């Protein structure tokens, strides 16, 4: 059950300077990069072309190449239209793609944010504002909805091209997506009140279980941290436990994960 995300970030600093940068994710693996400095979209995995032929990919890349130049000029012109209401610097973010389900089911989305706030989406056959959006956006929405050629292209991208492409992606990248890499654990301590820390690192995929333990008894003062990434697309996590100094004897950190195949990791203090 995987989500395909195209994440676009655009900065317009003043009327004559801007950049647009994109990265694309399938679940938590990066499949594409598109730096402002590059004419073309970059594959970050061998399978990032999916099951599209070289000619189909060219046509798709070309549509995006036209989009990027056009988006840039359109924002610049919409700014002029609303002036002096709204002004540079401006940050625009797009989150788009499709969430794949079993059978031939999917939901596609195109969400737009302006200065960090979600304000606009494509829905059905048109651009619309969402709850909490300021009223001045109704004029930009009205203008973008005037463009019938863009509406038909976007609808096709959302309804057809995304799910088709993502189905092909999943086939071509099955083995990279289903890989198992093993966690490695280690222990440490910081500041009579100690904090004990169980470090776990190098595990893929993301789901994992980490608890502090006395033999067969889960110490439910354990505070699990956030999942932090490593460069090689594996994960890092730490679970902390508070204790009285001297009382650290007999505590262990137990780590369960799908790559271990039953044989859990236990490290005793």
């Amino acid at each position, epitope marked *: 059950n995987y989500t395909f995300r195209c994440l676009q970030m655009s900065s317009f600093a003043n009327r004559s300077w801007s950049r647009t940068d994109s990265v694309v994710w399938l679940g938590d693996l990066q499949t594409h990069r598109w730096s402002n400095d590059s004419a073309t979209i970059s594959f970050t995995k061998p399978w990032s072309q999916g099951k599209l032929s070289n000619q189909q990919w060219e046509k798709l890349q070309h549509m995006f190449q036209v989009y990027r130049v*056009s988006f840039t000029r359109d924002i610049q*012109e919409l700014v002029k*239209m609303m*002036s002096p209401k709204e002004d540079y610097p401006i940050e625009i973010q797009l989150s788009a793609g499709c969430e794949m389900y079993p059978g031939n089911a999917s939901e596609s989305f195109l969400h737009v944010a302006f200065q960090g706030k979600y304000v606009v989406r494509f829905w059905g056959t048109s651009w619309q504002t969402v709850p909490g959006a300021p009223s001045w956006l109704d004029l930009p929405i009205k*203008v*973008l909805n005037a463009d019938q*050629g863009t509406s038909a292209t976007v609808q096709m991208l959302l309804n057809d091209t995304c799910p088709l492409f993502v189905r092909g992606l999943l086939e071509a990248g099955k083995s990279d997506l289903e890989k198992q890499e093993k966690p490695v654990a280690w222990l440490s301590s910081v500041p009579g009140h100690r904090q004990l820390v169980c470090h776990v690192s190098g595990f893929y995929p993301k789901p994992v279980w980490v608890m502090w333990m006395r033999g067969d008894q889960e110490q439910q003062g354990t505070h699990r941290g956030d999942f932090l990434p490593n460069a090689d697309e594996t994960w890092y996590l730490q679970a902390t436990l508070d204790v009285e100094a001297g009382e650290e004897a007999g505590l262990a950190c137990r780590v369960k994960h799908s790559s271990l195949g039953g044989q859990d990791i236990i490290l005793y203090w």
Partner: T-cell receptor, first 111, second 113 residues
Framework: AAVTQSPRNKVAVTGGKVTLSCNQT?????MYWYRQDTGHGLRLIHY???????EKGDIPDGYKASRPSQENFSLILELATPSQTSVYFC??????????FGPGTRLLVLE | TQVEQSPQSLVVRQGENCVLQ??????????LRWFKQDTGKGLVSLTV?????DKTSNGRYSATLDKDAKHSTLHITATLLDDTATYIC?????????????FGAGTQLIVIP
């Protein structure tokens, strides 16, 4: 959807102030001024997205624009030159791509 | 320039047909319009072509557009004296008022009565 220009024809002198005006009663937010010269297609001078806004076109130099109301968009030549001898067309439109043109204004600028 | 029109001018006898060419490099290409301009007068719209491969008609004027070739032709059947005019090709790069129009310099037609 009709657009009027005034004056329809004008003779002016170098250094003189010429004001070309455009009126439009359709409640269109957007207006546009072009000049036409032999051997070129129409070229955009200035445009406007609403009252109080003016924007530079492709060839803005020697021209100031002015949008005092929704109805009127004026092209001002503060210090007119012979190179501004041309036919000037104004246009308006709403949020769609169609631009509706006025009938044109001929300007001759003599020494 | 981004919009080239051919021929630059032509002389035809009343009742003959003629073909007018427009080639462009404009990107993107949302729509293409043909104007007629009588000497000293205004821009009268003849037809607007919007599709990938498009055809239109309007009495004696008919036209075509191929977006892949970036090419349009205007055909005038059975020319009349009043077709003496300049014919102008315009390409619009958006389907909204965010667009710019890219004007061709025009083909001059003279019909001999």
């Amino acid at each position: 959807a009709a657009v009027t220009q005034s004056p329809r024809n004008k003779v002016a002198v170098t250094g003189g102030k010429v004001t070309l005006s455009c009126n439009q009663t359709n409640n269109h937010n957007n207006m546009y001024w072009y000049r036409q010269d032999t051997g070129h297609g129409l070229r955009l001078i200035h445009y406007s997205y609403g009252a109080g806004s003016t924007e530079k076109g492709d060839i803005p130099d020697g021209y100031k624009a002015s949008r005092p109301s929704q109805e009127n968009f004026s092209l001002i030549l503060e210090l007119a030159t012979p190179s501004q001898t041309s036919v000037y067309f104004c246009a308006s439109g709403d949020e769609g791509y169609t631009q509706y043109f006025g009938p044109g204004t001929r300007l001759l600028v003599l020494e | 320039t981004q919009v080239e029109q051919s021929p630059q001018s032509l002389v035809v006898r009343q009742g003959e047909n003629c073909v007018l060419q427009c080639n462009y490099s404009v990107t993107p290409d949302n729509h293409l319009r043909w104007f007629k301009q009588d000497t000293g007068k205004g821009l009268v719209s003849l037809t607007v072509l919007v599709d990938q491969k498009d055809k239109t008609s309007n009495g004696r004027y008919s036209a075509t557009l191929d977006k892949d070739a970036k090419h349009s032709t205007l055909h005038i059947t059975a020319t009349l004296l009043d077709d003496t005019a300049t014919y102008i090709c315009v390409v619009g790069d958006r389907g909204s008022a965010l667009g710019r129009l890219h004007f061709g310099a025009g083909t001059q037609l003279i019909v001999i009565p």
